[PDB]
Design an enzyme around this catalytic site. Structure first.
Site, PDB file in Angstrom:
ATOM      1  N   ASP A  18      -2.758   5.487   6.616  1.00 57.17           N
ATOM      2  CA  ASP A  18      -2.677   4.624   7.800  1.00 57.17           C
ATOM      3  C   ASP A  18      -2.359   3.200   7.319  1.00 57.17           C
ATOM      4  O   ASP A  18      -1.341   2.609   7.709  1.00 57.17           O
ATOM      5  CB  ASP A  18      -4.007   4.651   8.579  1.00 57.17           C
ATOM      6  N   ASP A  63       1.594  -1.172   6.186  1.00 60.41           N
ATOM      7  CA  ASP A  63       2.167  -2.049   5.173  1.00 60.41           C
ATOM      8  C   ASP A  63       3.601  -2.305   5.551  1.00 60.41           C
ATOM      9  O   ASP A  63       4.035  -3.442   5.655  1.00 60.41           O
ATOM     10  CB  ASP A  63       2.156  -1.375   3.798  1.00 60.41           C
ATOM     11  CG  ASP A  63       0.761  -1.238   3.215  1.00 60.41           C
ATOM     12  OD1 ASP A  63       0.580  -0.383   2.312  1.00 60.41           O
ATOM     13  OD2 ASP A  63      -0.153  -1.984   3.646  1.00 60.41           O
ATOM     14  N   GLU A  87       5.448   1.104  -6.999  1.00 61.26           N
ATOM     15  CA  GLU A  87       5.575   2.143  -8.009  1.00 61.26           C
ATOM     16  C   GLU A  87       4.658   3.308  -7.642  1.00 61.26           C
ATOM     17  O   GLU A  87       5.134   4.399  -7.297  1.00 61.26           O
ATOM     18  CB  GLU A  87       5.210   1.581  -9.394  1.00 61.26           C
ATOM     19  N   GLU A  88       3.349   3.040  -7.646  1.00 59.53           N
ATOM     20  CA  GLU A  88       2.335   4.047  -7.341  1.00 59.53           C
ATOM     21  C   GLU A  88       1.845   3.998  -5.891  1.00 59.53           C
ATOM     22  O   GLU A  88       2.610   4.238  -4.948  1.00 59.53           O
ATOM     23  CB  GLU A  88       1.153   3.895  -8.313  1.00 59.53           C
ATOM     24  N   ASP A  92       2.689 -10.586   0.427  1.00 58.71           N
ATOM     25  CA  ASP A  92       1.890  -9.381   0.272  1.00 58.71           C
ATOM     26  C   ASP A  92       1.334  -9.179   1.679  1.00 58.71           C
ATOM     27  O   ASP A  92       0.395  -9.861   2.083  1.00 58.71           O
ATOM     28  CB  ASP A  92       0.751  -9.692  -0.700  1.00 58.71           C
ATOM     29  CG  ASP A  92       0.276  -8.488  -1.464  1.00 58.71           C
ATOM     30  OD1 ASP A  92       0.453  -7.356  -0.995  1.00 58.71           O
ATOM     31  OD2 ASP A  92      -0.294  -8.684  -2.547  1.00 58.71           O
ATOM     32  N   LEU A 124      -0.434  -6.696   3.341  1.00 53.33           N
ATOM     33  CA  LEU A 124      -1.847  -6.319   3.431  1.00 53.33           C
ATOM     34  C   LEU A 124      -2.424  -6.351   2.004  1.00 53.33           C
ATOM     35  O   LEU A 124      -1.685  -6.190   1.040  1.00 53.33           O
ATOM     36  CB  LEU A 124      -1.980  -4.934   4.050  1.00 53.33           C
ATOM     37  CG  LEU A 124      -1.616  -4.864   5.530  1.00 53.33           C
ATOM     38  CD1 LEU A 124      -1.681  -3.429   5.968  1.00 53.33           C
ATOM     39  CD2 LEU A 124      -2.564  -5.726   6.357  1.00 53.33           C
ATOM     40  N   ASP A 125      -3.724  -6.588   1.850  1.00 56.29           N
ATOM     41  CA  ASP A 125      -4.284  -6.657   0.506  1.00 56.29           C
ATOM     42  C   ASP A 125      -4.597  -5.314  -0.145  1.00 56.29           C
ATOM     43  O   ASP A 125      -5.043  -5.278  -1.289  1.00 56.29           O
ATOM     44  CB  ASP A 125      -5.514  -7.554   0.468  1.00 56.29           C
ATOM     45  CG  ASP A 125      -6.705  -6.963   1.199  1.00 56.29           C
ATOM     46  OD1 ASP A 125      -6.591  -5.879   1.802  1.00 56.29           O
ATOM     47  OD2 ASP A 125      -7.777  -7.594   1.162  1.00 56.29           O
ATOM     48  N   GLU A 185      -0.835 -11.166  -6.451  1.00 52.16           N
ATOM     49  CA  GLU A 185      -2.207 -11.397  -6.049  1.00 52.16           C
ATOM     50  C   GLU A 185      -2.955 -12.500  -6.770  1.00 52.16           C
ATOM     51  O   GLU A 185      -3.427 -13.458  -6.155  1.00 52.16           O
ATOM     52  CB  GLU A 185      -2.996 -10.092  -6.173  1.00 52.16           C
ATOM     53  CG  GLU A 185      -2.706  -9.087  -5.075  1.00 52.16           C
ATOM     54  CD  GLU A 185      -2.070  -7.855  -5.595  1.00 52.16           C
ATOM     55  OE1 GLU A 185      -2.737  -7.132  -6.349  1.00 52.16           O
ATOM     56  OE2 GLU A 185      -0.898  -7.612  -5.261  1.00 52.16           O
TER      57      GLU A 185
END
Lengths: 320, 323, 326, 317
Positions: free
Chosen positions: D50, D55, D78-79, D99, D101-102, D265
């Site tokens: 979700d 995102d 990537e992941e 960015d 969403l964190d 971040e």
């Protein structure tokens, strides 16, 4: 894609059309309108714990607070059954803002819509305002030559902010979700003609024989078989807006009861006329151009015939 | 500060209405909450003379979803320039809701206000892509008899304020939408429309298409009475907007028959009946110029009728001139 | 069927006869109260313009609660013993229902940094009543004597005010979750019969107090940090907010715990006001609520501010800690 | 009542920033207003994995709001990680790294989440070369002009720093406008709150294990440290910023480099904390003194009160 008032304003200043100081003024006025818009919507609930006038005052205070960063703001008290006018003078003295909080003091006329009207003047070289200030403002603010910008904010089924900085008319709609004004129309042009007249025919028997005739010829099923359409909300901003968008003619003529119209020249007629002229229309007092009429009195009144260029010229004909 | 929901649950409690109807009325208001928002952002929405029409459609879909829990909803399509009517039939078959999404298809008339109009009937007969057909449109007209099975009615005005007016058969109540909490707050109990009001709402552009009866009526209103003050003329163009102002401040609203429309423009079942039931509950009168609108039994699918609605005395006065 | 609001859902239940109009109005009024409290929480910063910042809010929230249940009954207040949140108790004019309401879940600004919430329980008194908000000692004694969680707690729920505003409720037949739609200001049923996972490698404790816990607990805590199977130990998550930490435990599984320590000999959470409603809810979601040895609901409130240790969450997780505490 | 917009225009008028940047900062906030709403209705939205598509949706909103300022590409994840949106002004005067969403986890976004952005001044998917080019242009320790984040929790907070202090703007639900609620925020020089995921205690170095242990020692006051860990970077960072303490995302056995990405971040957060009077380290050096050589570069993070961070460094020496 989406352009907000702020984006739009900064671009204009980037182009050097207006300075930061004026960008702040115009931005602050809209800020005030966002709040007035909310007072209007909750007015019924507000009253649980007649109301239209009490709203005029509250609206002027919101206006004053929002412009404390630009200048001090005094108030021109409603002589008669008018709305009290808030006048803001920049600390710099480079800009003056005449603000009409709500377009009326009647609950009947504000049943579905109402709005704010503002004009911005630039002085040359020369809280209730006193008689020495009133006469001064009147002389300092000349719509014809030193009116820089003008606009209004309509509070109806939608909240519209219309503005002109001297180079066309722009319309910004208020997005309920994000609390921001989004440019929804550029260089608005009022149609050359429209089969719509906006008058209060209840006063038909108080009008001159000139006007009674004009009014009568409108009801004549023309070329086709369709007569003019009559639309009159009662709201100056509401009636004016619809005329601006769909064309036609609006009028507040002088009658037996009001020998010189009801609408005030400086506070209501001038801004509306500057806007309509930028939208490609005409604003007349019946015989002449509204802007050229120089205010001699504080609450000076004048008859208004404003709207599509051909429609206004038509009425001017029956009235000459 | 009583909200619509509180007020609704209380009524259900006194047994004035059952839970089923409470859910229906509650769903309609949720729909109106969403439609109110569509109306407000329409300009921005278009950034992505028919805008009023597409809005009609979107509004009916919102209505359908909100009432999906109560029943299925068909549609009586807009033949001419009428608004497409949404008809909801409870799965139980105890109620039917006739819903008018917006009050008009014109952008000119919706410049400052518009609104939804609904009526709820209780069938005394049998049962009945989304657009209803002839056999059904007929069924509905026959089943919905405003004079009898019309249980409740109301409207939601979308203007400088969003007002939801309702009557369940015992008075007219007005609920204002609080922008902050997204809820309707009861701002007026047992609304009563004044017996008279010196305000008339007509489209005088059609003056020369009216009967000599009416022309006289209209003219005598402009006569400054002994108070030297004639009538005030106000006409938004919006049925809901004009009706509402008449309901609050008094006066008379009229949509008479002329030469082009020998039978008026307002549809009997979809527009006239709900508004007339409401005004009669507010202490007013709803007539076709001669007889009580609710006395007329709907006989044709898109049946239209002249409307003179407003203050009791004001309407009786026009009936005189038309006598 | 497509969009079920709290109101629709409530009326349907009363139709099945699961609840009466009176309770339907109570539950509905509570949610109304929660809609306004949600708004107070969101604008609190601005409100403060024009660290007890959370203590004031407690009070304001109880007044909103009282007004909204004005139509159902009168509401008094059981004042904060220490650093507790003042509890609002509403007694129906009919005397059929009593509502114990916890306005916010804490008095600390640190713990309410990202979330907080209201907790409520509804009891069906068998005995007497009380008059007219600070409740007197004898009055408070009657509430505690009348509110027996293990036998007359009818319904319970909470409303989480976080990145989302959630209203969770149980009327004795499963747990339902309603999300608040910002646009229409109405709670929409987003989850039916919520079931908390039987197991979950997550633990929610305040390890800052590790050296104040019993050796029993210290060994439990330690065995969690052992990379088990795939070589993955437990995940630690502690917001500080009882409602926030409880909610996450209810949705994703795991165990939450507020054990007794050197300073706090009997824990910190109050039995009747906090632990009981949360336990009834978790039990309905298929979980377990314990004090380390016995089922929380088996305990009977006997003191006005009786505190108790709380180990609540997934059934298997709570049984595991009890196995150590044994 | 100073709103974000008023405050922004004043800074420009004062020549502190230009109209172009004023428009950028203003657009970012319009984007956050919409993302804030997506987050709030996500459950209902799902009635019609979700925090993953959310995102995406959030990056599209970001792109549209800055279409007036420039074009925006995307640095694919990537992941599990969050896809990063990079906006380049048509002028080429500014690059905005956003960015959305964190986090990508539903567990961690249970009560809060947020957006993080940074703006560099250079002296649909973006491929290798483009990325390789952004790491060389975006040099935190030299061309990072402004940074901020918008927290979406029980409250919607917009924190910003244009190089001269940290300002906090709260979103008024009623008027849909960010209102300045705090000027020149200063993070305390010390605070007894530590924010770490102790579940990984056995994966940490012996250095760190000893730091963690000494925190649990009831000080001369008979009071140990308070532990608070939301799981949300923006949520945990914000509370640290307001009440003080230390937050940490150290390297463990498996992740010899930590989990938090340097450029996306750690950098903006570090610039902000330093403007609030704090410190942001990787355990040994300043974070803004590290230059990526790949964008998806990760680094351990110890950020918070100046004294608290210096203490962990002592243990890490």
């Amino acid at each position: 894609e989406i352009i907000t008032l702020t984006s739009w304003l900064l671009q204009q200043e980037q182009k050097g059309i207006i300075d930061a100081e004026l960008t702040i003024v115009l931005s602050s006025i809209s800020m005030a309108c966002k709040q007035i818009a909310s007072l209007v919507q909750r007015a019924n609930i507000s009253n649980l714990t007649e109301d239209q006038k009490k709203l005029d005052v509250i609206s002027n205070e919101v206006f004053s607070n929002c412009l404390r960063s630009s200048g001090r703001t005094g108030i021109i008290a409603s002589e008669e059954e008018d709305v009290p006018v808030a006048v803001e003078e920049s600390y710099s003295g480079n800009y003056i803002v005449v603000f009409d909080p709500l377009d009326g003091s009647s609950n009947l006329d504000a049943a579905v819509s109402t709005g704010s009207i503002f004009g911005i003047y630039s002085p040359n070289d020369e809280n209730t305002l006193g008689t020495e200030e009133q006469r001064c403002i009147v002389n300092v603010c000349q719509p014809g030559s030193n009116l820089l910008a003008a606009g209004y904010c309509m509070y109806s089924s939608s909240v519209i902010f219309v503005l002109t900085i001297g180079k066309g008319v722009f319309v910004f709609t208020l997005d309920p979700l994000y609390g921001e004004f989004v440019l929804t129309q550029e260089n608005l042009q009022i149609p050359k003609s429209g089969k719509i007249y906006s008058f209060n025919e209840g006063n038909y028997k108080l009008w001159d024989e000139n006007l009674k005739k004009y009014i009568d010829d409108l009801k004549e099923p023309g070329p086709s078989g369709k007569p003019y359409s009559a639309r009159y909300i009662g709201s100056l901003v509401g009636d004016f807006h619809r005329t601006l968008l769909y064309g036609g003619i609006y009028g507040y003529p002088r009658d037996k009861k009001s020998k010189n119209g009801k609408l005030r020249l400086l506070y209501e007629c001038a801004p509306m006329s500057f806007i309509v002229e930028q939208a490609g229309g005409k604003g007349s007092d019946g015989h002449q151009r509204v802007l050229d009429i120089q205010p001699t009195e504080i609450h000076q009144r004048v008859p208004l015939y404003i709207g599509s260029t051909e429609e206004v010229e038509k009425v001017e004909k029956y009235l000459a």
